[PDB]
Amino acid sequence: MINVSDLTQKLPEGSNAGVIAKNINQNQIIADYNGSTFMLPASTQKVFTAVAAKLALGDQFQFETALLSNGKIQNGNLDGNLIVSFTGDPDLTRGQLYSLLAELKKQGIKKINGDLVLDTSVFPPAAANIDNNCFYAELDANKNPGEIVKINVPAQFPIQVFGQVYVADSNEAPYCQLDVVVHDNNRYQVKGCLARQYKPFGLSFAVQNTDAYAAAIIQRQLRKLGIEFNGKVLLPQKPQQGQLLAKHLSKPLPDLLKKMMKKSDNQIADSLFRAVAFNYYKRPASFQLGTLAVKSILQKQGIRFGNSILADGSGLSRHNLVAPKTMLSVLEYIAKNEDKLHLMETFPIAGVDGTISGRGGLISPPLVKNVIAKTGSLKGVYNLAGFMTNARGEKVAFVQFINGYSTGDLESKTKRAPLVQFERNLYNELYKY
Amino acid sequence: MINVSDLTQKLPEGSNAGVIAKNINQNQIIADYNGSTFMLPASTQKVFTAVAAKLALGDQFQFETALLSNGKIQNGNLDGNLIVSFTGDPDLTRGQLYSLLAELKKQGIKKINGDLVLDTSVTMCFNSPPAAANIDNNCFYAELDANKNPGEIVKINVPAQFPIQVFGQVYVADSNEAPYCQLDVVVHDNNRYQVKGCLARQYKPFGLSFAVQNTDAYAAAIIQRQLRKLGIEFNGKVLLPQKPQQGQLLAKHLSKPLPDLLKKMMKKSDNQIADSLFRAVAFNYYKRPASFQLGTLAVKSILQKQGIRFGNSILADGSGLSRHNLVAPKTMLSVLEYIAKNEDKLHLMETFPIAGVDGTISGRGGLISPPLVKNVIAKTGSLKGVYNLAGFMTNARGEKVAFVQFINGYSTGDLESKTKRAPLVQFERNLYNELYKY
Numbered sequence: 001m002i003n004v005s006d007l008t009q010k011l012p013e014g015s016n017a018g019v020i021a022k023n024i025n026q027n028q029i030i031a032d033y034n035g036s037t038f039m040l041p042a043s044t045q046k047v048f049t050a051v052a053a054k055l056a057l058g059d060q061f062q063f064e065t066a067l068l069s070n071g072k073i074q075n076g077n078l079d080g081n082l083i084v085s086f087t088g089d090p091d092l093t094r095g096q097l098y099s100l101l102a103e104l105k106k107q108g109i110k111k112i113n114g115d116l117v118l119d120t121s122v123f124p125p126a127a128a129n130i131d132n133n134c135f136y137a138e139l140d141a142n143k144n145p146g147e148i149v150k151i152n153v154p155a156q157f158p159i160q161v162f163g164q165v166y167v168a169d170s171n172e173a174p175y176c177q178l179d180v181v182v183h184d185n186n187r188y189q190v191k192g193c194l195a196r197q198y199k200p201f202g203l204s205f206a207v208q209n210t211d212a213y214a215a216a217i218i219q220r221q222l223r224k225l226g227i228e229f230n231g232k233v234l235l236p237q238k239p240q241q242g243q244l245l246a247k248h249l250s251k252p253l254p255d256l257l258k259k260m261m262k263k264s265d266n267q268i269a270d271s272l273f274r275a276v277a278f279n280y281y282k283r284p285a286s287f288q289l290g291t292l293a294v295k296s297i298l299q300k301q302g303i304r305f306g307n308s309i310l311a312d313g314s315g316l317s318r319h320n321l322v323a324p325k326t327m328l329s330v331l332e333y334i335a336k337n338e339d340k341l342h343l344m345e346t347f348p349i350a351g352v353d354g355t356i357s358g359r360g361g362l363i364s365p366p367l368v369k370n371v372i373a374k375t376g377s378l379k380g381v382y383n384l385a386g387f388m389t390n391a392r393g394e395k396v397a398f399v400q401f402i403n404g405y406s407t408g409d410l411e412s413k414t415k416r417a418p419l420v421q422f423e424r425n426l427y428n429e430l431y432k433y
Numbered sequence: 434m435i436n437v438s439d440l441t442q443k444l445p446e447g448s449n450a451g452v453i454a455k456n457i458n459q460n461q462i463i464a465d466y467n468g469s470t471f472m473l474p475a476s477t478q479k480v481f482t483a484v485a486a487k488l489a490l491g492d493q494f495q496f497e498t499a500l501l502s503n504g505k506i507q508n509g510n511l512d513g514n515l516i517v518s519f520t521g522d523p524d525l526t527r528g529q530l531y532s533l534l535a536e537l538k539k540q541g542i543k544k545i546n547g548d549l550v551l552d553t554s555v556t557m558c559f560n561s562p563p564a565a566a567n568i569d570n571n572c573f574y575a576e577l578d579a580n581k582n583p584g585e586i587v588k589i590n591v592p593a594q595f596p597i598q599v600f601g602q603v604y605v606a607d608s609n610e611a612p613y614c615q616l617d618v619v620v621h622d623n624n625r626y627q628v629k630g631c632l633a634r635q636y637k638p639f640g641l642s643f644a645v646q647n648t649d650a651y652a653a654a655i656i657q658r659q660l661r662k663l664g665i666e667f668n669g670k671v672l673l674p675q676k677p678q679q680g681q682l683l684a685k686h687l688s689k690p691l692p693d694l695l696k697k698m699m700k701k702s703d704n705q706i707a708d709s710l711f712r713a714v715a716f717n718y719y720k721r722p723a724s725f726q727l728g729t730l731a732v733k734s735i736l737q738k739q740g741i742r743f744g745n746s747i748l749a750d751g752s753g754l755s756r757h758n759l760v761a762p763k764t765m766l767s768v769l770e771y772i773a774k775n776e777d778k779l780h781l782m783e784t785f786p787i788a789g790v791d792g793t794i795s796g797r798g799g800l801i802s803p804p805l806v807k808n809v810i811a812k813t814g815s816l817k818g819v820y821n822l823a824g825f826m827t828n829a830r831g832e833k834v835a836f837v838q839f840i841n842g843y844s845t846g847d848l849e850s851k852t853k854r855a856p857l858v859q860f861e862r863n864l865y866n867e868l869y870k871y
């Protein structure tokens with residue numbers, strides 16, 4: 001075997017690596033180092049969600065956002081509620097929702113009579129995603145040290161940002177972060193400080209109450225369209241029986257999976273995860289339901305998980321526990337079954353695209369243009385799961401998990417130079433073996 | 434050295450161990466297995482906090498909770514504001530807040546003219562905001578009656594002494610629907626809790642333990658209930674200014690002093706005490722409102738001047754709850770030695786739990802038999818997947834052994850099953866026997 005222990009010698013002190021590689025042609029493990037330890041997979045977890053979506057959902061699957069009602073359309077009139085059905089489209093734009101609201105005119109509706117009803121069916125992303133569910137505020141931090149920073153909320157966001165962030169007397173642009181606590185109805189409170197800065201800038205934020213964010217946005221929207229709504233907003237817990245008035249469809253599975261994999265989009269992963277459960281189980285979907293359904297389905301294919309912990313679709317969670325060799329095994333299922341699944345194309349490509357176009361240790365020959373890999377990142381965690389071709393035109397699957405990687409403070413993640421030297425030498429050896 | 438690697442074959446497949454042990458008497462490391470891998474320490478991290486506290490706080494430290502006023506006591510009235518000062522006391526009870534306020538009566542006060550001003554400076558109940566204002570651990574009990582037929586709505590019972598509101602519409606699910614239920618708790622503003630989902634029919638009373646989210650509101654409402662029951666009149670505003678508040682000291686509650694606080698934190702692993710002390714340490718050492726990041730810098734720095742070297746450890750908290758903690762066993766070991774070497778001045782040895790006698794190891798299966806029982810002392814750490822010990826024992830030749838044991842990655846089941854400890858019990862029984870006999 002390759003000598004991995006030699007390589008980890010220059011990863012920072014105290015880190016741990018889990019590395020394993022199999023030459024698919026020769027049917028032979030050619031590297032195997034802590035191959036069996038459970039570690040944090042981070043975004044390499046999406047490999048599993050990919051394969052599970054393929055199997056349980058299929059290529060024709062699409063996310064559906066839908067307008068409905070039981071009311072009789074009268075003259076301009078809608079004599080019932082407007083139920084708006086959200087099913088976790090991770091892709092939905094403000095743009096597209098508006099367009100869906102438009103089908104209400106073309107059908108003659110001037111005035112909606114009853115209430116606005118919002119329907120959900122999953123139990124960072126939710127039923128109602130709009131524009132990646134996030135926003136920004138405008139900070140002006142060109143003030144005196146010790147003096148309040150001016151903050152604005154673009155008018156297009158139904159958000160409050162209160163609290164008060166003073167300027168950092170550089171006597172302390174060390175002892176300083178920015179505390180953000182959320183309150184009922186997307187009211188965000190801010191505290192602490194920043195360092196003096198000349199230009200104006202943007203702080204991005206996740207939307208916490210997405211239900212409410214989406215009912216607010218919809219109401220701006222019926223107004224801009226001249227549809228008179230005067231009712232309440234109901235957020236029932238049950239599916240809402242109504243009559244299909246109109247619908248909006250996401251791009252389909254292969255594009256969704258292409259974006260997830262190449263780019264490492266968490267929301268696609270974690271909505272797909274849950275969509276997988278909703279379909280396998282035919283009922284509202286938790287993350288737990290998602291674990292059950294994704295293990296069960298990969299298990300019908302002969303993937304053995306042991307006591308692996310698969311806590312989400314994207315691998316963000318610090319409770320995920322899986323061993324290289326189980327990741328390794330899912331890859332080989334991918335290669336073997338490529339003819340049918342077409343998952344090989346989704347992996348980013350070294351020095352060419354997705355999350356590893358510029359990846360330091362991969363952008364020379366013979367790895368540039370050769371090594372494809374789903375990457376994974378957290379603070380202290382740098383992973384690669386994927387494939388390459390060696391000196392004989394042979395195929396090689398691998399899995400590199402690195403955890404507890406640490407060289408610096410809360411003030412910043414320090415140098416990646418050991419990572420880059422590690423991966424370089426690592427993949428060079430796999431090539432050459 | 435001990436072949437720890439063979440003992441690990443007894444742990445569940447997947448798990449990782451870090452083990453290191455020094456025989457202090459000889460100055461010999463006698464086990465060194467991943468001695469240098471950073472791992473999750475869990476509650477053993479209160480070992481760092483305990484030493485930093487002895488050194489910066491000192492044995493005469495007490496937390497203060499205090500009444501102050503700018504007013505004057507005249508003719509039956511405090512003419513001015515009631516200031517109530519909270520500084521993180523994690524043991525404060527409703528009852529002691531009560532007597533503290535009753536000192537107001539005793540002092541002539543049957544009505545206050547000004548407002549109530551609170552002053553600061555820093556789902557379930559194990560984590561719990563160790564906040565400036567703690568009352569009854571910031572923790573309350575609801576009771577769910579789900580002894581009812583499939584279909585029915587679960588009765589929620591809040592005891593009346595809690596100023597909170599639990600609400601919602603949980604229903605009882607038939608045993609078909611039953612395994613698919615989620616019960617959850619959505620936290621709304623000003624201590625209002627919404628519980629949704631269902632559970633299976635239940636045949637005892639189901640309890641919820643909630644952590645209070647808005648501790649400042651919580652305390653203010655309580656203080657008002659207590660002024661009313663005391664027959665002190667008050668009609669003013671409840672103000673929460675964020676800066677320290679001036680006033681003449683009218684009265685002051687003091688907690689038990691540090692040795693008690695430490696004995697309880699070490700023996701029983703109290704998270705609140707650890708996270709409270711972690712911050713008092715910052716306040717006192719830097720003299721400034723204190724946060725977790727300040728706690729981190731101060732503990733690191735206090736220990737550093739004593740010779741402890743942290744390298745790139747991450748100490749995210751005083752209690753070790755956080756899963757961002759990273760520290761290498763060998764680093765834990767040097768604190769242990771430092772603790773055994775300066776025992777004459779620190780007296781931390783007696784705070785350690787005692788195999789089969791007390792604390793969180795009085796019933797620890799891998800330690801219940803001789804020669805470990807009454808010999809091994811050790812701080813435990815536990816989280817889902819983590820099972821650690823940090824302590825000392827006397828070996829067969831009667832010399833002192835200091836050890837550290839980190840186990841992470843421990844999984845024997847579905848993510849919400851009762852973990853099986855039999856592998857753990859085995860591995861510990863064997864490891865400690867090796868350290869004893871070595």
Ligand SMILES: *C(=O)[C@@H](NC(=O)[C@H](NN1CCN(CC)C(=O)C1=O)c1ccccc1)[C@@H]1N[C@@H](C(=O)O)C(C)(C)S1
Pocket residue numbers: 042043044263264265266314315316355375376377378379
């Ligand atoms: C998968 O590994 C993804 N990584 C991240 O999302 C990671 N995100 N985090 C880490 C910390 N937390 C805790 C609350 C987050 O909010 C959070 O979302 C992250 C994000 C930015 C920079 C570093 C790490 C995705 N995959 C990664 C990859 O390497 O493929 C990214 C960087 C593309 S994100």
Ligand SMILES: *C(=O)[C@@H](NC(=O)[C@H](NN1CCN(CC)C(=O)C1=O)c1ccccc1)[C@@H]1N[C@@H](C(=O)O)C(C)(C)S1
Pocket residue numbers: 475476477559560701702704752753754793812813814815816817
């Ligand atoms: C230190 O290790 C302490 N462990 C825990 O509190 C621990 N886990 N918790 C409580 C806090 N949260 C907040 C989200 C958790 O999710 C969580 O894991 C715990 C609590 C109860 C049961 C098991 C683990 C204390 N030390 C432990 C020890 O072994 O000495 C305990 C179990 C005595 S608690």
